[PDB]
Write a protein that binds this DNA or RNA. Sequence first.
DNA 1: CTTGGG
DNA 2: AAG
DNA 3: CTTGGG
DNA 4: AAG
Lengths: 248, 248
Amino acid sequence: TWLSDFPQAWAETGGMGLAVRQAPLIIPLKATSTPVSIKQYPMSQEARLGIKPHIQRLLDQGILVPCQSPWNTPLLPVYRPVQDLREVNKRVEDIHPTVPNPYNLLSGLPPSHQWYTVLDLKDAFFCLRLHPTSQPLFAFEWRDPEMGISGQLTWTRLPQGFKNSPTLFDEALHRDLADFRIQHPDLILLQYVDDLLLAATSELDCQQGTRALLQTLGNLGYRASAKKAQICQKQVKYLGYLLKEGQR
Amino acid sequence: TWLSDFPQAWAETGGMGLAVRQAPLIIPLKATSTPVSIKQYPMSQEARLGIKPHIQRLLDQGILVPCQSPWNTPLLPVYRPVQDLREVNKRVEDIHPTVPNPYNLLSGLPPSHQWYTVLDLKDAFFCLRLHPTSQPLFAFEWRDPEMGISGQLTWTRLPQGFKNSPTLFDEALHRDLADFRIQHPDLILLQYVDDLLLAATSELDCQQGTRALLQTLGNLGYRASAKKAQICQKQVKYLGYLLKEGQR
DNA sequence: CTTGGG
DNA sequence: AAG
DNA sequence: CTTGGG
DNA sequence: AAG
């Protein structure tokens, strides 16, 4: 089965991802920026108990680590944690937006290629490491009142809510799949951040290309959702479109 | 004095005007128009007593007459009467707006002409007769509760509040002063509806031209305000501007 | 939580 | 609505 | 009176 | 504010 042929490629069986070929990312600040430390809004016990298992899981995975940082942004007190990084975003140097819009991306699908595989990468941003010099930027406060820990944590991977994460991830995955494209010139591969479409001229080619793509992704350290995958279909849902008979 | 040399030309001494050379005006309706009869809003006794002497004066002057008309528009219940003619205005055919704006009008004043006379015509619109076929358009209701008269009156002269009155008056006065302009080619005459500026190169020429203009206006049936007149001045107020040393 | 078109 |  | 830009 |  697809599940058992590629255990490393699926999030269900391969463990947390880590893009081993990608250098830890340095996040350049704007020329005038200095750290901003926003105090954590008090949060209800109900919210804290809701957030706690997520924090503990991320700590266990090494995705969060303790720190002391002159930067601090709040977690939203109203469960899964959402960090308000707007004041960090304002201080980080802008980058060119290179992710194509879905309409343009799909124009690259020609009618000759009507067998599709759609993969969704799980926890994609967390596969990319942050350089230790950039980790303090994203710190937040975590207090466990009935344990006694009140200090800061920060991210060791590219965080949710950071304005450049989609673009940096898309560019990293493009670097990591550049050789795959070269080895499979008969295949169309569309990338939209963590959403991938592979297109082939036949069922057989789609099957062989999907095997190759899963092998490559797993080896590089990315993880696809086995439960959401649409494998070797003549009709798929991709980026809000239903792709069917070359339409849409 | 200017008052006594031209008794016919001044409103103070010449009586109500009447432009004797101008045919009574016919007011064309739009192609689809039919009469509209708006009921008179009840008006307080205080307002009625305030309006009454004006109505009686206009009746005595023949400017208002009794009628029966399928048209009716209201008098404003909050003193001097103001008729809301907006529903008549909507039904009257539009005419080209030929009154120049003051900025453009004043551009026709050259520096060679620095002696000014400014005249303001009194009750200008009322100098123009309305054709009997057009009089019913402007009817309104007048009730004298402590006398017993409840019927309609209408205007026999061009009314205030009618959308074409400024343009029709300006065009009529232009026709009536066309010969004056021909007889006095050295003079500048600016007309803005009922506000006139005469300009000459010298005090003497301004004096002679003002005598001629007052004689002409009075003979034609128009009346100027003796109290507001600015006669043979090197500086005057005209259309919101102070004219002085060729400036403004 | 704070913030930035009838 | 967005972080 | 009724009406038609933050 | 305008009639």
